Write a structure and sequence with these properties.
Layout (H helix, E strand, L loop, with lengths): L2 E6 L7 H6 L1 H6 L2 E6 L3 H10 L4 E5 H9 L4 E10 L4 E4 L13 E4 L4 H12 L8 E4 L2 H9 L5 E4 L3 H6 L3 E5 H6 L5 E7 H6 L1 H20 L1 H5 L2 H11 L6 H5 L2 E2 L3 H8 L2 H15 L20
Length: 298
């Protein structure tokens, strides 16, 4: 009997159908404790302490973890992040320079913290000119409802809660085009990968398999009602928001997973770590992160 704790996050993406279906548990034979985390920083800490063995990390928490030499490896990609996450601001904030003096929330060292700093740099705004406050997404929603913040760079469900009365100022598809793309990945502790490699392979298989029908034909996948309801439930968004969220990322074929895990992801960590160091968020970085990536489970 194998027990495994999987840290998941509130993305509405096609592999959530496998989570809802319990496919990984059924195919691996393991007892799977799916634990929801509000953002990636707390997942890194749980990975490091051993409380979580498989976790969904954004590329920015990944880079932080790898620079701290946490013994984890990316073993597949969840998605390439696009306008599924966005900077949403009070409607009176109409142009980037209106952000100066305003109070903008992000979860600390998340992909949207990283994307905010990259967007500010692109706009020629020093980060200190904005009151960047660190809040978890549920607290961001509550702070927005009470008018205590002027905006936030967030993912689902907070991005959809805020956009209902706010304005999108930029998004992570644009920030990627500017030269600061972000990724969503799955990582595994070394000791778990050593003891239970077939369980790790089963996890990767269940996620990759679940995304392929969407990749093959997004519109056909999105009109299957059970695909939409499973994503709405696990992410916490209304069903009407799911299609735009799903189409706000791109996903990988098995061939693309192997290709990405053999070079591109390493380069992504190198570059993400470097920008985080320039923004003063990590003290030291490396010129190579090949220890933190593997294709052997796909």
């Amino acid at each position: 009997m194998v027990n495994v704790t999987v840290a998941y996050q509130t993305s509405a993406e096609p592999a959530k159908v496998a989570q809802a279906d319990n496919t990984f548990a059924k195919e691996s034979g393991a007892t799977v404790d799916w634990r929801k985390f509000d953002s990636g920083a707390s997942i890194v800490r749980a990975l490091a302490s051993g409380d979580v063995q498989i976790g969904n990390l954004g590329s920015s928490p990944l880079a932080v973890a790898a620079s701290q030499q946490v013994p984890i490896e990316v073993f597949l990609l969840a998605s390439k992040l696009g306008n599924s996450e966005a900077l949403v601001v009070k409607k009176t904030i109409s142009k980037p320079e209106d952000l100066i003096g305003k109070r903008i929330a992000v979860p600390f060292i998340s992909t949207t913290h990283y994307s905010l700093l990259a967007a500010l740099k692109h706009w020629g705004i020093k980060p200190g000119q904005v009151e960047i406050v660190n809040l978890q997404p549920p607290a961001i929603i509550a702070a927005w409802q009470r008018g205590d913040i002027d905006g936030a760079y967030v993912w689902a469900p907070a991005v959809n809660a805020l956009e209902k009365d706010g304005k999108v100022l930029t998004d992570s598809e644009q920030v990627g085009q500017w030269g600061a793309p972000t990724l969503d990945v799955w990582v595994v502790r070394k000791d778990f990968a050593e003891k239970h490699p077939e369980v790790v392979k089963a996890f990767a298989k269940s996620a990759i398999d679940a995304q392929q029908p969407y990749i093959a034909n997004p519109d056909v996948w999105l009109k299957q009602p059970e695909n939409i309801s499973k994503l709405a439930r696990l992410s916490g968004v209304p069903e009407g928001d799911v299609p735009g969220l799903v189409k706000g990322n791109t996903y990988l074929t098995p061939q693309q997973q192997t290709a990405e895990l053999t070079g591109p992801v390493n380069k992504a960590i190198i570059d993400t770590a470097q920008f985080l160091k320039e923004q003063g968020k990590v003290p030291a970085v490396a010129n190579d992160y090949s220890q933190y990536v593997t294709s052997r489970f796909v």
